[PDB]
Amino acid sequence: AAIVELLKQLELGLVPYDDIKQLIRRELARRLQWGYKPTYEEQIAEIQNLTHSLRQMKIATEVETLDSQLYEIPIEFLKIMNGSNLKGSCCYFKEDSTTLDEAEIAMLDLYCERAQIQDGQSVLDLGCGQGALTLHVAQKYKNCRVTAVTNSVSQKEYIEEESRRRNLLNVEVKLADITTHEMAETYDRILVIELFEHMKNYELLLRKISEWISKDGLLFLEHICHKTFAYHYEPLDDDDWFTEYVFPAGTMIIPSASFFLYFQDDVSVVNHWTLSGKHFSRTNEEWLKRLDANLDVIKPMFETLMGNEEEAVKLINYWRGFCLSGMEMFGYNNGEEWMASHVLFKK
Amino acid sequence: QTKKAAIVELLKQLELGLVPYDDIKQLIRRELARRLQWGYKPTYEEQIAEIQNLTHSLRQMKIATEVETLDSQLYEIPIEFLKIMNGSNLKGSCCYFKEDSTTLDEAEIAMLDLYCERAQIQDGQSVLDLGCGQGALTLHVAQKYKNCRVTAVTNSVSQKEYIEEESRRRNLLNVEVKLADITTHEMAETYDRILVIELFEHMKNYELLLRKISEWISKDGLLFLEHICHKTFAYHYEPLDDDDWFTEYVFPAGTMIIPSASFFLYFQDDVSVVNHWTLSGKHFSRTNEEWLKRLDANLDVIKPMFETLMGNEEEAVKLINYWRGFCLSGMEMFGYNNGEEWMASHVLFKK
Ligand SMILES: Nc1ncnc2c1ncn2[C@@H]1O[C@H](CSCC[C@H](N)C(=O)O)[C@@H](O)[C@H]1O
Ligand SMILES: Nc1ncnc2c1ncn2[C@@H]1O[C@H](CSCC[C@H](N)C(=O)O)[C@@H](O)[C@H]1O
Ligand SMILES: COc1cc2c(cc1OC)C[N@@H+](C)CC2
Ligand SMILES: COc1cc2c(cc1OC)C[N@@H+](C)CC2
């Protein structure tokens, strides 16, 4: 009700950044109050309830209404906001000199390091995005056989096209929905960068993925998380505007750092890392600098995409919201609440 | 320099029973505080990396070290002493106090019931009790699941003693007891439910131990585990520094590990976690406290017993204050910060 006018102000870009950030922190602080429990017994039971609950769901509900609101994004826009590698996920900022572009590379190298990728292997990039990791792995290891899987077509066409121009003869893009796709091939490395947040039955999904791992192969998983608790992105109450601010409810789950430790039926954990929230926070902060600095080019292309001025404005302030959501959320408490998690699995 | 010698004087005062209970609790809390400080990390990244350093280093060890010198200093205790210090079932592990007026006996019973609930024992099952102690669980499960066939495993000639005798004395078919080093025991038998109550703390290489135990699980069988823990970090029970007198006060060096509550989540190569609970440190705190009350109230019968077992009053004194420090260590460690630091973890595994 009284949030209906806040959402409207945010749409019209009336609320300045300082004010936005503080209103967001208020919402985060309320989420921590909600998520943290007085006794560790309860805290653990809340993870046990969510794990058991997801085990009676389908691999992912509402699969490509997610992929037409987001992910079917103009390439030309993502080239403005994202870095050169078009990484649509956490980047890694070692030092403060670290630009967005280096931060992209740093994170991608770390993946290859931590997934233990060697020149002649089959490599599978599930939820490939704009192909940042696929192209990286292809340029880096000439004899690797990379297969990037997406359900989008704007993504598929770009990666295919980009391979050709970068002259990467070892990339293969496969258009499919992973929730229902079955493939009889098998791979030495499987890589999943921030896909699981959109899915539900991690048991069925990891059972499905476990079979695409050849013997002695490995599955590498990045997911954002909270340090301690886990939850569906669903409003706390009548006053929570932040949860559905950017992601439409039902599209998102925020795992605990330990979450997929509870899903080791068909894969077994080998290694586990986490990584400060300040990394994704700066990533978002550089995505935001990128919008605001290129408004002059963004407005006219938004203005033609939405044949309209009623709405070119709402879409630009949507993307600010995205950025400021990630900036403050993962930034919260010097990066020690919401953060990223890296898990390495064998069969 | 003199702080090394200050410590050794403290240790002998404790052996001689010259330090009042409150002074002991105060000093223990100071070490505890310092372990928390050494344990917690300023970034979560460093915290998780610490768990990985330990999970990985254990995988290169053997299943257990100091095995028979653990069965000698501890776990070969005269039963006559245990019936005084422990409650009716001689449970030498965490009991469950739901209400402020829960007795020790009641509390033993409540934990034992909770094990059967969480391991989902059912009247027609084959049950293996690894590291059975004085068989508090074996006898309990045996009793009113008459068509179970409980099997207890111990490397302690004194523990095989008491169970076999007290199991025919209560007119029980089911109970069978085997004397074996679990570190080296192989067996071609196979069980619907394997219960492990506070055994792993003495082990090292958990990947090798759990590989072995899973081979003893029947199809659709379960593994139920209890281990004490700290909620966040894990560690070998080795001294922080030279001023740490508490870490080796009770348990011999290199015989104990304190896992994180999350620890065995990382040892799932041959088993698979189905459920996971923790349980407030107030239960084991209160348990150790009820044990301590039972000592002091029966010094009249414990003193001659310890004289008879030792050869001289000097060592009988040292021994009774040993057991006091056992229970005091337990009280303060697990009751620390209202029981939300050191505590008990329950894990249910399938094959
Ligand atoms: N059900 C599904 N089937 C196939 N691909 C999916 C999918 N759901 C989401 N995706 C893809 O997975 C990606 C998750 S966002 C991650 C982007 C990319 N992995 C990167 O690192 O930059 C989206 O870009 C989308 O293309
Ligand atoms: N290496 C080893 N092999 C077999 N048993 C061992 C062992 N190390 C310790 N134990 C046994 O494991 C138990 C740990 S104390 C727990 C006692 C019992 N489970 C109870 O709850 O009452 C003791 O009985 C000890 O004798
Ligand atoms: C900006 O906030 C978020 C950004 C992203 C994610 C989650 C965010 O906040 C929870 C998920 N990744 C899959 C895509 C990027
Ligand atoms: C009293 O402190 C402890 C008691 C016991 C344990 C650990 C204790 O302190 C860490 C372990 N169980 C195996 C045996 C009982």
Side-chain angles (χ1 to χ4, degrees), chain A residues 216-271:
Chain A
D216 311 313
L218 302 154
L219 161 64
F220 179 83
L221 168 72
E222 178 184 285
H223 69 80
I224 44 90
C225 68
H226 188 269
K227 177 167 77 182
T228 296
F229 54 89
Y231 57 108
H232 288 286
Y233 252 36
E234 295 174 321
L236 292 58
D237 54 16
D238 264 342
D239 292 356
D240 180 21
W241 61 266
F242 177 73
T243 304
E244 277 167 329
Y245 183 32
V246 190
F247 299 88
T251 53
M252 205 73 181
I253 311 190
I254 309 310
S256 56
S258 73
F259 208 61
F260 301 93
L261 302 182
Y262 288 100
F263 291 96
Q264 291 195 68
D265 293 290
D266 320 280
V267 289
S268 214
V269 52
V270 171
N271 225 327

Side-chain angles (χ1 to χ4, degrees), chain A residues 302-317:
Chain A
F302 274 49
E303 187 178 356
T304 59
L305 189 125
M306 329 292 303
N308 171 330
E309 51 264 45
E310 171 198 21
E311 266 176 88
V313 131
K314 287 163 186 189
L315 191 60
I316 175 191
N317 281 315

Side-chain angles (χ1 to χ4, degrees), chain B residues 265-281:
Chain B
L265 299 183
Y266 287 105
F267 287 99
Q268 291 194 78
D269 290 353
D270 311 285
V271 298
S272 213
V273 63
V274 160
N275 217 333
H276 184 198
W277 308 256
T278 67
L279 178 135
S280 165

Side-chain angles (χ1 to χ4, degrees), chain A residues 148-204:
Chain A
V149 159
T150 178
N151 51 340
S152 151
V153 359
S154 181
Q155 289 178 344
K156 170 172 168 70
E157 288 176 352
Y158 178 76
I159 303 165
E160 273 180 2
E161 234 146 82
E162 263 292 306
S163 301
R164 261 192 298 272
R165 320 215 310 279
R166 232 152 203 161
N167 207 20
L168 277 39
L169 265 65
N170 50 340
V171 186
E172 179 190 0
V173 190
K174 271 168 153 64
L175 200 153
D177 173 359
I178 308 183
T179 75
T180 65
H181 188 86
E182 290 288 349
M183 60 162 48
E185 281 75 355
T186 214
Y187 305 86
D188 306 318
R189 299 298 187 265
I190 294 194
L191 295 113
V192 178
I193 313 306
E194 306 192 2
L195 163 59
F196 278 43
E197 298 89 331
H198 299 302
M199 316 287 277
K200 306 294 185 235
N201 195 331
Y202 299 142
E203 191 196 4
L204 288 176

Side-chain angles (χ1 to χ4, degrees), chain B residues 75 92 198 201-202 228 251 256 258 284 288 326 330 333-334:
Chain B
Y75 299 139
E198 293 186 21
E201 292 95 321
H202 298 303
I228 51 86
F251 301 89
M256 279 273 326
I258 310 296
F284 204 16
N288 280 279
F326 185 90
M333 161 182 272
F334 288 88

Side-chain angles (χ1 to χ4, degrees), chain B residues 173-329:
Chain B
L173 182 159
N174 329 128
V175 184
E176 158 188 345
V177 188
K178 310 188 167 312
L179 197 78
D181 179 24
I182 298 176
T183 292
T184 50
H185 188 73
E186 296 287 11
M187 63 181 302
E189 246 185 11
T190 281
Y191 300 85
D192 299 325
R193 264 141 184 83
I194 303 171
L195 305 168
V196 187
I197 312 305
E198 293 186 21
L199 170 73
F200 280 29
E201 292 95 321
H202 298 303
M203 310 294 129
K204 299 302 184 197
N205 188 329
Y206 293 129
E207 174 194 326
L208 285 181
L209 187 56
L210 283 170
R211 188 172 316 281
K212 176 181 283 168
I213 294 178
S214 69
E215 295 172 2
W216 303 337
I217 298 181
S218 293
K219 225 183 156 178
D220 301 11
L222 307 183
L223 170 62
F224 176 76
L225 172 67
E226 182 186 280
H227 60 97
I228 51 86
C229 67
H230 180 268
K231 73 171 162 199
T232 305
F233 53 83
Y235 56 111
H236 289 283
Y237 221 35
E238 313 165 347
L240 294 167
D241 57 3
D242 295 287
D243 291 76
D244 181 3
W245 61 271
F246 175 77
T247 302
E248 279 165 3
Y249 180 41
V250 163
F251 301 89
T255 50
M256 279 273 326
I257 279 176
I258 310 296
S260 54
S262 75
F263 207 65
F264 300 112
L265 299 183
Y266 287 105
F267 287 99
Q268 291 194 78
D269 290 353
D270 311 285
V271 298
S272 213
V273 63
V274 160
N275 217 333
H276 184 198
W277 308 256
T278 67
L279 178 135
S280 165
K282 277 208 300 228
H283 301 277
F284 204 16
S285 188
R286 281 209 51 198
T287 295
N288 280 279
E289 176 182 19
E290 291 293 312
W291 286 343
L292 173 64
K293 281 173 195 167
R294 284 172 174 251
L295 290 186
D296 300 333
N298 309 278
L299 291 173
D300 56 332
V301 49
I302 294 183
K303 180 93 187 184
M305 175 186 299
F306 278 12
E307 275 160 8
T308 300
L309 179 58
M310 305 292 95
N312 56 97
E313 303 198 43
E314 293 80 86
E315 294 190 53
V317 170
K318 290 183 179 108
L319 189 51
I320 171 71
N321 286 311
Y322 167 83
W323 279 111
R324 284 166 173 167
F326 185 90
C327 300
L328 292 181
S329 290

